[PDB]
Amino acid sequence: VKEFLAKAKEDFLKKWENPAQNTAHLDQFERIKTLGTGSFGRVMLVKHMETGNHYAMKILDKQKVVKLKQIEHTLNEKRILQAVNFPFLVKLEFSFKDNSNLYMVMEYAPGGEMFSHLRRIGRFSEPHARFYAAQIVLTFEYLHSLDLIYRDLKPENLMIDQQGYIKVTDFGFAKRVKGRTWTLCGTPEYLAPEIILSKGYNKAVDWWALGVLIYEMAAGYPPFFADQPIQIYEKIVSGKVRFPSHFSSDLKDLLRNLLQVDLTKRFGNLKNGVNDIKNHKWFATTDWIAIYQRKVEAPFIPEEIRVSINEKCGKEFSEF
Numbered sequence: 001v002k003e004f005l006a007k008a009k010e011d012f013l014k015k016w017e018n019p020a021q022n023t024a025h026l027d028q029f030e031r032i033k034t035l036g037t038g039s040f041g042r043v044m045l046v047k048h049m050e051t052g053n054h055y056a057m058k059i060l061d062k063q064k065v066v067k068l069k070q071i072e073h074t075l076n077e078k079r080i081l082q083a084v085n086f087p088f089l090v091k092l093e094f095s096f097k098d099n100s101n102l103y104m105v106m107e108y109a110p111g112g113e114m115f116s117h118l119r120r121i122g123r124f125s126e127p128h129a130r131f132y133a134a135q136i137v138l139t140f141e142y143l144h145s146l147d148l149i150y151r152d153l154k155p156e157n158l159m160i161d162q163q164g165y166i167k168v169t170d171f172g173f174a175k176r177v178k179g180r181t182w183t184l185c186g187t188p189e190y191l192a193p194e195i196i197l198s199k200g201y202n203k204a205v206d207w208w209a210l211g212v213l214i215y216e217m218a219a220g221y222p223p224f225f226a227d228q229p230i231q232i233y234e235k236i237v238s239g240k241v242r243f244p245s246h247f248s249s250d251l252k253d254l255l256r257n258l259l260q261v262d263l264t265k266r267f268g269n270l271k272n273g274v275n276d277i278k279n280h281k282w283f284a285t286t287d288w289i290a291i292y293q294r295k296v297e298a299p300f301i302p303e304e305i306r307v308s309i310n311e312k313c314g315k316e317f318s319e320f
């Protein structure tokens with residue numbers, strides 16, 4: 001049964017108290033190309049020279065992490081990532097550091113990412129949409145089981161691997177909390193209301209987020225949108241949603257129960273909790289273990305690194 005979860009709460013708690021450090025070195029890798037550069041670090045497709053494989057290497061300038069006051073978000077991302085295992089979570093393969101930089105070597109997810117697929121296709125049929133939502137629910141079941149709130153769900157973070165399945169990436173806003181917490185963070189279209197009204201909030205913000213994701217997937221656009229962020233903030237608070245013509249009925253009611261402004265009458269956060277997600281008419285034709293196992297047919301399958309001679313920021317990244 002869910003002896004699987006307590007077996008994984010153990011595996012994660014052990015890696016959490018004694019995280020792995022220094023499991024590779026930059027010399028044993030080779031620059032192919034710069035995938036991207038930005039908020040989440042500067043990432044590089046690289047090849048492991050003694051094995052053949054490819055990986056996404058995120059490189060962070062330590063001095064710049066300190067300047068931008070991102071020390072603890074960075075240590076925390078790494079610490080969570082090296083402790084978690086689930087088939088829809090991208091894997092921190094290796095991590096290490098050197099004089100100038102930190103390095104997180106990740107599974108390379110080469111099939112592009114969901115934001116970009118919505119953009120170019122237009123929208124997903126409801127079955128296709130439902131294939132992804134399943135993986136996210138099973139992912140949020142796991143993460144929530146180890147007391148990890150995700151807080152960055154959005155299409156841009158959801159890569160599509162070579163068997164059509166989803167890998168969640170970016171743990172930058174992830175937090176380990178048993179109780180409640182308060183940081184205003186995350187993509188505005190995806191924020192649940194209690195985050196904006198600056199009360200505390202809990203695990204439940206990830207299910208609101210799921211609903212925003214389900215909507216955006218199914219519809220082609222997110223349910224609360226504007227040219228300005230406070231205008232997105234304003235709509236979420238007012239809780240008024242217009243489903244487009246072609247939405248099915250059973251779905252249109254799923255999105256009323258995940259996008260519920262009222263904490264206690266909201267799916268995910270209940271007596272039952274997660275099973276209200278699974279035991280529901282829109283997920284009737286969804287085998288919840290064939291998804292885990294990867295047996296379902298997926299609906300669609302597509303600079304110099306200057307390193308200083310002197311060590312920088314030694315004490316502030318000693319845990320890394």
Ligand SMILES: CN1CCC[C@H]1CCn1cc(C2=C(c3c[nH]c4ccccc34)C(=O)NC2=O)c2ccccc21
Pocket residue numbers: 035036037038040043055056058090106107108109110113156157169170171
């Ligand atoms: C910057 N955005 C454009 C593409 C996706 C998005 C960033 C989301 N994202 C994708 C990451 C990963 C990968 C990326 C694949 N193509 C990219 C292009 C830019 C940035 C990252 C990636 C990857 O292969 N494995 C990953 O884990 C990643 C690693 C750490 C933090 C955020 C990340």
